[PDB]
């Protein structure tokens, strides 16, 4: 199959590109619970690109998939919480479209492999 010091230099670097996306660095950290002391009662696995980080770093993406996976719960975790008239639920809308291109091409880099 493939290595695993690539794959990690390729998921490292769309871990970038998809921040890059999120320009208000909203999705950079976890949801504080200090702010919103009901997002727990809601949502059942809390995502952010600091914890994604922390995941890759410890080995936990070994694919893509998985990776991906983490992605898309920062996103519908902000569609489920948020009322649609809000900024936070566009926000998500347009990661969920800047992002799914950001992740097309990091796949097909992924299977060069
Ligand atoms: C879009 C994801 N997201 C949500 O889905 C919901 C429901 N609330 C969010 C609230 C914040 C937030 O509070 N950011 C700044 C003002 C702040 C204030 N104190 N602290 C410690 C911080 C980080 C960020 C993201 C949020």
Same mark, same amino acid.
Do not use: G, Y
């Given at each position: 199959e493939m290595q695993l010091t %690539?794959?990690?230099? &390729?998921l490292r670097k769309t871990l970038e590109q998809l921040? *890059?996306?999120d320009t208000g660095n909203i999705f950079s950290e976890p949801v %504080? &619970?200090?702010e $919103? %002391?009901?997002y727990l009662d809601h949502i059942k696995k %809390?995502?952010?690109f600091f914890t994604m980080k922390q995941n890759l770093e410890a080995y936990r993406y070994l694919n893509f998939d998985d990776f991906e996976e983490d992605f898309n719960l920062i996103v519908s975790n902000c569609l489920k919480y948020n009322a649609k008239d809000t900024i936070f639920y566009r926000? +998500? $809308?347009r990661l969920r479209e800047q992002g799914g291109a950001v992740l097309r091409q990091a796949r097909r880099? +992924? *299977?060069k492999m």
């Open positions: %690539p794959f990690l230099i &390729l921040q *890059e996306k %504080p &619970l200090s $919103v %002391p009901d %809390p995502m952010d926000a +998500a $809308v880099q +992924a *299977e």
